[PDB]
RNA sequence: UACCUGGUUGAUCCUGCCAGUAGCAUAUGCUUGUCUCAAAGAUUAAGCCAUGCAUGUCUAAGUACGCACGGCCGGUACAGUGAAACUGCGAAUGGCUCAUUAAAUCAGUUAUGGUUCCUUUGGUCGCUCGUACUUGGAUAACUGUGGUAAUUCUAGAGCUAAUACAUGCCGACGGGCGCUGACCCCCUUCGCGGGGGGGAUGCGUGCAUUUAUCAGUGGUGACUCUAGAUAACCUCGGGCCGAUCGCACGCCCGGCGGCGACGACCCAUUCGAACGUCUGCCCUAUCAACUUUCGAUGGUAGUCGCCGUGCCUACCAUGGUGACCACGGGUGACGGGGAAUCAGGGUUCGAUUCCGGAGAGGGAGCCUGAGAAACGGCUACCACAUCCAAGGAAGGCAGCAGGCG
RNA sequence: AAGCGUUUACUUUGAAAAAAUUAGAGUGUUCAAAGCAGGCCGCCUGGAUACCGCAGCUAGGAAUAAUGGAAUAGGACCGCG
C-alpha cells in the first residue's frame, strides 16, 4: 500500500472479539492509542456485542457523545478507542464499573468491580528511560510515561497507579512464587504461580508457571503479567479463575448443572 | 487569453503555473498546470486594455470622475480603526466602529455593526491569566515532585549505604574466618 | 531522478534482475551540493518525514576545534589543499567531508596569548602598535603570577605546529558533513596525523 | 606496516594527540559467550568493519561454515553444507549456499577447510552481512 | 469402502493401450411448479469507451459588515440560523485486475543496537538573564467592467478577516554556577618565598542540531546507548518557548481564578512503511560456462539518501557464481492461507471476496502532503480519441451499471 | 542458584505460529444446507478443541552415519629457574 491502513475486514478481525460473519464486510478498526491492534477490544464492540446495551453503531456514537462512558480517568468521545487489558470503564448513570480482564478462554470478560477497586489499576512497565536532565522514566504497556519512580522497579515489574492523579502507589517485583496472568497466545487466560525462570543470552527468555491445581506450563516473557505476591492477588477475579480444565470436565459441569436446574 | 507580467513576449506563451502565480487558481493543494498567456508588450493583437488613471488632468470626464462610488466595507480590525480615525490606545473603539444602515421594502429598517476582531476583552484577559497560571502550576509541580524524589533518593542512598556496610562487615567476617 | 536501489543491478552470480516495480519515492536520490568558498548560501530541502536538511553551496566560515586543549573557534576557510577522495575536488575548490584546508590561526593565537601569556607566531622584528596584546601580556598581579607560571609550565607546543602558527595557516580536517546539515566543522590536525597529511601533500606537490 | 591508503587510518573512539609530559586502543565485548581474541587488543592495525574494534554490532543469528576461498582481502568465502528433506522422496540432498563473510584481521592462522563461526550484523557491503567471531582449526594437520 | 469390466485369437495365458466407472469445474441442448442460499467479462481483447455516479467535510469551541431569513432591550462591536468563500484535514482509504515478475513476490523465524512515522494516548512546554490590556500589510465572499465559440478559463478598479503570511517583547528577574578578576585581609620567613579566605565590571549559563575532549545515574548477551561536565555555531530558502476560540460566573481592596477545544520543539506508544538473516518455487542442456574498466566481486575516502550497503563517485586487488544445474530461455507462472480427488503415498487447480506485491494503454519526471514516483494529481513522448467559429481547449471505466469488438 | 563443556545429521518435549476454510462440542434456522445462536421465571451461558507441511530457538540422549586427537613427537598433566 501507499500508506497506513484505515479499514479492517470482518474476516481479518481477531478471534477474541468473537464478531459474526453474516452482518458486515468490514470490522471496526481500533484507533491509535495505548494498546496494539490484536490485543484490545474496541468500545463499540464492548458496548454493542458484549453488553448488548445499544443496537447500532449510530446508537454507540450517541452513547459516547452524551458523555456517559468514562474510560480510566477521562471521557473519550470515539467509538473505536483501543480498550485493552487492565482498563476501567466507568458509566456514571448505571453506577457500574467494568474492568477489562481476560476470561479463561480467549475472550475478555464482563467483570464488575466496586468503585473502591476502580479508583486504582495495575500496569506492567515495559522499559526504563533516562530523560534529558537525568530523570528516570517508566514506560508501561498502556504507554503511561511516569517519571521520578521508586528505584526498586525493574523492567518486568508492575506498578499500581491511581486514576485520579496518575501517580504510583505500590509495586510488584518479578520474583519466583508470584501469581501470573498470561496475556497472549495459546495460554490466553491462565492464572498460576511462577515456579521457574530460564534466561537466554541473545534468545528470548521463558518462564515456567505452575497452576494452583498442578498444571505447569511454559510461557514466553512477552505475554506475562503478574497480578500479586504469592497467593494474594490485588485485583478481583472473574469466574473460572484461570484454570482451563478439560473439555470432558466442561461437558460434565454443563450437563450436571443442566440436569440440576431442569 | 489573459496577460502576464514579465514573460516579455508579443505572441502566446504556455507556462507552468502554480499556487502564488497570476492567471491560475489552484484546485488541489499544490496543483501545477500548463496555461496559455500573453506577453507584457502591448500590440494591436489584443481585445481589451485595462487602464488606471493615476493623475487627473484639467478637464472633468462625466463618465468616471462625475459619479463617485463609496467604499463597500468599513474597517474591522481595531488597529485599522485607530489608524483611520487617528485614535489613541485608551479611547473607545466600540463607539467609533463604522456601522451600516439597511433598508428595503417589506422589512423594517435596521443598522448592522461588524464584529471587531482582536479587541481587548476580559475573556482574552482570563485566557492570558490562564496559561501563565498553568505555567505556575507546572513549575510548582516540578518543584514538589523534585523534592519528593530527593527525599526518596536520600532514603534509597541511606539503605544502599547500609547494605554496603553490611557487605563490608560480611567481608570482615570472612577475613576473620 | 536517480534511484537508490539494490534491484536495478546484477545479482551476486551475474544474472540480471528484471524490474517488478518502477522507481519509488523512498528510493530517493538527489544531486550533489558541491559547496564552494564564499558568502554563506545555505538552502533548505524538505526530506522524508517532514524534516529539513541544509545544502551549503558557498561557505567560508567553520567552527573548528583544537583538540589538545579542546577549544573551537569560528574560522574562515581560505584554501583547499588535500582530499583523499578525488583529485578534481582539490583542483576545483570543493568542500566535502574529510578535506584538509588551510584556516586562519589568529583566534587560536589570541586565545593562546590570552590564556598562557606566551608569544605565539611573532617573527622577530615586529611589535604591535595598537598595544592591546602588549597590555594582555603585561600587567600581572602578585598571586595570579603563580597561576600564569603553572600555565606556562604546561604550554609545550610541537615543532610542525609551531611552524604552521608561524606561517599563520593551520591544517584542518572537515569532520562534519557539509552538504547534509549545512555546517562544515572540523578539527585541527596534530602529531602523526599532521605528519601523514603533510607527507601526502609533499608527495602530491613533488 | 599500516596506513598504505590515501587518507589517515585511525579509530573513531580513541584520541592520540594528547599532551605528552603506546597508543590507546579501543575494544569491546561481543556477547553470546564469545571471548575476545588477544591480537585484536594487542595489534596496532585498525578495521572499521571488525566486530571487536569497529562500529558494528552482532545481532540476530549466529551460524557456522567451512572456509573454501581466501583470495579476497579483509574478507573470505565460506561454504555451508546442509541436507534438504523432500516429503515425497524420503531421502536427503546436498545443497550449499556460499555466502561472503568479512574476515576480521584479528585471526591470522586461517586456512581452507577450517570450521568458522559467523554472526549476523548490518550489511557492510553488497553480499556481506556477517562477521567472523571465532575460528576453530580443522581436523588434524597440526603443522 | 485400500474395488473392477469389455476389446487382439479357432480357443488360452501374459505385456500392453483403448473403451467403459464415479466426482470436482467450464460451455452447450431439452424441459421446468415451490422455497432457502448462491457463482456470475477471468480464460481470446491489462482491447476501446458515449452517458450518469463513485471524496468531500462545521462544531456553543479558526474566520459571518450577502437583511437569504431574522428578536427589539439598543447606540457598550457581534441576538440566533446562515448561501458563497479563505483556512484545517481527508483525497496515499476503499473497489477492480493479475499485465509484469521464477531467491523476485510471497510463506515460516529474526532484528532496525542501521531508519522514518499523520492522528490518538502518556510524558514536556516561568528552567534561557535580553506596543505586550495584543504588532504589520495582502487577499477571497461582495460592488462594478468584461475577453473567448467553448473549460471546474479567469483580470485590471474599491474594500474587508485570521489558528492563511511575517515581526515580536513585557512577566518569571533576585539572586545562584564557571570564568576572566581590578583589589583587600590573616599567619610565618630579615627578605624573596609559602599557605588560607572575601570581592567591583563584563561574558556565558532552557530544550533540539553540529565538532571534539574528560569521567563513568540507569540498562542490554552486547554501544560510538541514555545521561554529566568541558570551548562555540544554532543556517534569514530562520526550530519551540501559545500575539487562538467557546460556556455558565465567582474572591480581594485594578489584581486573581474553572470546564474544555485547537495548534505545537522534543521523548515514548500504536497503525504501519522499508531495508536486512536462514530455509522453501514449474519446465528446459536442441542453454556449459556466466558477470567485468557502460560496477562485475571487495578495500580505502567521499556524494545522495530517513538510515547500513558500489546506490553512485576517485584510486587500488582480480575477484564473484557454477554439474549440488549458475547463466540463458519459456510458462495458458502473482505468491500464500486454501479447493477437488483421495487407503498410505501422492496428482491437479489457485485470477477470484482473507493477507502481502504490481497498476490504472506503454515508459519516464515532479509539486503538495507525515505517508504517492499518486494517475476520479499534474508534466513531456508513442498509440487511441472529443468539441471547434479553425485561433484553441480537453481525456484516461484492469471502479459501479451500461455500449462495440 | 549462575557460567563453561568437540562439531554435525537424528530423535522427544515447550513457546511463538492471524482469521475464513478442514474435522469436531453445544444450539430445533419446522428438518437440512447454514448461522453463532437461545431457555427460563434479571439469570444461565457459550461462541471450544484438533491439524498447522518446511526452516529457526530452547531443554535431555549418544545407538546409528560422518569427524579428529600423539607416531621426523613443537604430545598432554602437577610443579620450578
Outline of this structure?
Chain D: The modification Citrulline is found at residue 20. Chain D: This is Small ribosomal subunit protein uS17. The structure is cut from a larger assembly and holds chains A (262 residues), B (177 residues), C (206 residues) and D (143 residues). Chain B is an alpha+beta fold.
In words, what does this structure look like?
This is part of a larger assembly, with chains A (262 residues), B (177 residues), C (206 residues) and D (143 residues). Chain A folds into three domains: 1-116, no CATH class; 121-171, no CATH class; 174-244, no CATH class. Chain A is 14% helix and 30% strand. Chain A has helices spanning 43-50, 57-65, 115-118, 247-261, and strands at 41-42, 69-71, 82-83, 88-91, 96-99, 101-102, 108-109, 112-113, 120-130, 136-140, 145-147, 158-162, 168-172, 179-182, 191-198, 206-211, 216-220, 224-225, 228-229, 232-233. In chain B, the strands form two sheets. Chain B has a two-stranded antiparallel sheet with strand order 1-2. A two-stranded antiparallel ribbon of chain B has the order 3-4. Chain C is of the alpha+beta class and 206 residues long. Chain C has three domains: 1-30, no CATH class; 31-105 and 169-206, no CATH class; 106-168, no CATH class. Chain D is mainly β and 143 residues long. In chain D, 3% of the residues lie in helices and 24% in strands. In chain D, the strands form two sheets. Chain D has a five-stranded mixed barrel with strand order 1-2-5-7-6. A two-stranded antiparallel ribbon of chain D has the order 3-4. Chain D is elongated and about 75 Å long. The interface between A and D is small, with 2 and 4 residues. Chain B: One of its GO terms (molecular function) is structural constituent of ribosome. Chain B: Component of the small ribosomal subunit. Part of the small subunit (SSU) processome, composed of more than 70 proteins and the RNA chaperone small nucleolar RNA (snoRNA) U3. Chain B: Residues 157-177 are annotated as: Disordered.
Query: What is the multimeric organization of the chains shown?
Result: part of a larger assembly
* Terminus-to-terminus distance of chain B: 106 Å
- Which two protein chains have the largest interface (Cβ within 8 Å of the partner's Cβ), and how many residues from each? C-D, 15 and 14 residues
Number of domain modules of chain A: 3
Return the string of H and E elements of chain A: EHHEEEEEEEHEEEEEEEEEEEEH
Tally of alpha and pi helices of chain B: 2
Report the C-alpha radius of gyration of chain A, rounded: 20 Å
Work out the strand percent of chain A.
25-35%
Number of helices of chain A: 4
Instruction: Please identify the structural class of chain A as seen in this structure.
Output: alpha+beta
For the largest sheet of chain B, list the strands in their spatial order: 1-2
First-to-last CA distance of chain A: 57 Å
Subcellular location (chain C): Cytoplasm; Membrane; Nucleus, Nucleolus
GO cellular component, one term (chain C): ribonucleoprotein complex
Keywords (chain C): Acetylation, Cytoplasm, Isopeptide bond, Lipoprotein, Membrane, Myristate, Nucleus, Phosphoprotein, Ribonucleoprotein, Ribosomal protein, Ubl conjugation
Pfam family, one (chain C): Ribosomal_S8e
